[PDB]
Amino acid sequence: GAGPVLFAVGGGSLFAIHGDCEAYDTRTDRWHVVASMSTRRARVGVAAVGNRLYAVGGYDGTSDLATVESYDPVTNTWQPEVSMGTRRSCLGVAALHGLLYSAGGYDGASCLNSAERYDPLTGTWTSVAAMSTRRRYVRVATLDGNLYAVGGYDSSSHLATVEKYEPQVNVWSPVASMLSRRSSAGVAVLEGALYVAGGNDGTSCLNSVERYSPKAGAWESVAPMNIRRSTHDLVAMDGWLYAVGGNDGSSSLNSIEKYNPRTNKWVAASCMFTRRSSVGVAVLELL
Ligand SMILES: [Cl-]
Ligand SMILES: [Cl-]
Ligand SMILES: [Cl-]
Ligand SMILES: [Cl-]
Ligand SMILES: [Cl-]
Ligand SMILES: [Cl-]
Ligand SMILES: [Cl-]
Ligand SMILES: [Cl-]
Ligand code: NA
Ligand code: NA
Ligand code: NA
């Protein structure tokens, strides 16, 4: 065998919030329309847990959502799940030891530093230790058994700071700060390194990319993307990085580019049907 399939869920465009979804087949470089969600969700957290898709929170054009829904690729369908304790748009979402974490975001009034976790067996959310920082527009990714919360926006500054959640003790700890301030960046783990691509640093949309090694605890610059992207998403697929959707500062992107770390190079791929900024992305193993 089963191969990786990329899923672009929700997002927005000019004056639009999407509920539709599409899937990218790496073998054929082709996109396929898949089941639409029950709710329109942009700025949604999307994570794969148990080879099932979870769309967490988001913004439906009027409200910041607490609701969650789930995608079954076998039947190609979505279903409701238990809602979070907080409404969260612009959040980070990741899978860790089989549990689904939601960190940071915006509840309609404040930038959140809180976090909670979902056990899909019991369908239950429990709060977890809060981050040291309010992190709107945060991204979250799992590396070596820890959660990494990357950049974001407290109510006033764009952040270059990073935290990591240790679940053995339920504690957030600082991580070396990135070389750049970034909100709405794309974040993904590839061959043991945490890649952060694009984002907005408070001044412009970024095409720069950096990566973090936990062994050293150090950040290192990497080839920039071909297109400046904020609110896009980043995912690891079959040895490559895929940067999906986002915004170049004016137009919502349907563009896709992929990063080969052996050549340190970015190359375009087949673009989506829909333009999706603040899009959720995840990878399933399917055959
Ligand atoms: Cl399918
Ligand atoms: Cl976002
Ligand atoms: Cl890992
Ligand atoms: Cl700032
Ligand atoms: Cl600075
Ligand atoms: Cl990833
Ligand atoms: Cl390859
Ligand atoms: Cl375009
Ligand atoms: Na806990
Ligand atoms: Na270290
Ligand atoms: Na490839």
CATH number where 160 lies: 2.120.10.80
For residues 30 and 262, what is the distance between their CA atoms, to the nearest angstrom?
24
Of 178, 90, 87, nearest in space to 136 by CA: 90
Taking the centre of ligand 8 as the mean of its atom positions, its distance from the CA of residue 243, in whole angstroms, is 15
Taking the centre of ligand 9 as the mean of its atom positions, its distance from the CA of residue 157, in whole angstroms, is 29
Of 120, 177, 169, nearest in space to 149 by CA: 177
Which residues have CB less than 5 Å away from ligand 1 (the ion)?
73, 76
Report phi then psi at 213, rounded to 5: -105, 125
Starting from the CA of residue 215, give the closest ligand.
Answer: 10
For residues 220 and 179, what is the distance between their CA atoms, to the nearest angstrom?
8
Instruction: Find residue 156's DSSP bridge partners.
Output: none
Taking the centre of ligand 9 as the mean of its atom positions, its distance from the CA of residue 277, in whole angstroms, is 32
Q: Six-digit token pair at 177?
A: 């700060």
Taking the centre of ligand 1 as the mean of its atom positions, its distance from the CA of residue 18, in whole angstroms, is 19
Number of domains present in the structure of the chain: 1
Taking the centre of ligand 8 as the mean of its atom positions, its distance from the CA of residue 94, in whole angstroms, is 30
Q: Which residues contact 69 (CB under 8 A, 6 or more apart)?
A: 37, 38, 39, 54, 55, 78, 79, 80, 81
List the resolution, Å. Answer: 2.6
Starting from the CA of residue 145, give the closest ligand.
Answer: 3
For residues 261 and 275, what is the distance between their CA atoms, to the nearest angstrom?
27
CA distances from residue 83 to 65, 108, 120, 214, 231 in whole angstroms, order as listed: 9, 16, 12, 33, 23
Starting from the CA of residue 239, give the closest ligand.
Answer: 7
Contact 135, 92 (CB under 8 A): yes
Place of tokens 């329309």: 33
Taking the centre of ligand 9 as the mean of its atom positions, its distance from the CA of residue 131, in whole angstroms, is 13
Taking the centre of ligand 1 as the mean of its atom positions, its distance from the CA of residue 33, in whole angstroms, is 9
Query: What is the separation of C-alpha 186 from the centre of its chain, rounded to a whole number of angstroms?
Result: 6
Taking the centre of ligand 6 as the mean of its atom positions, its distance from the CA of residue 94, in whole angstroms, is 9
Starting from the CA of residue 106, give the closest ligand.
Answer: 2
Q: Six-digit token pair at 65?
A: 């959502």
CA distances from residue 40 to 62, 107, 177, 230, 272 in whole angstroms, order as listed: 10, 17, 34, 20, 18
Taking the centre of ligand 1 as the mean of its atom positions, its distance from the CA of residue 37, in whole angstroms, is 14
Taking the centre of ligand 7 as the mean of its atom positions, its distance from the CA of residue 4, in whole angstroms, is 13
Starting from the CA of residue 166, give the closest ligand.
Answer: 9
Pairing of strands 92-96, 77-81: unpaired
Taking the centre of ligand 11 as the mean of its atom positions, its distance from the CA of residue 188, in whole angstroms, is 16
Q: Six-digit token pair at 94?
A: 């990741």
Starting from the CA of residue 284, give the closest ligand.
Answer: 1
Of 52, 57, 23, 22, nearest in space to 40 by CA: 57
Overall size of the chain counted in residues: 287
Of 96, 165, 155, nearest in space to 130 by CA: 165
Report phi then psi at 240, rounded to 5: -115, 165
Contact 165, 112 (CB under 8 A): no
Owning domain of residue 13: 1-287
Taking the centre of ligand 5 as the mean of its atom positions, its distance from the CA of residue 255, in whole angstroms, is 30
For residues 117 and 242, what is the distance between their CA atoms, to the nearest angstrom?
26
Strand ranges of the sheet holding 265-269, from the earlier edge strand across to the other edge: 233-237, 240-244, 256-260, 265-269
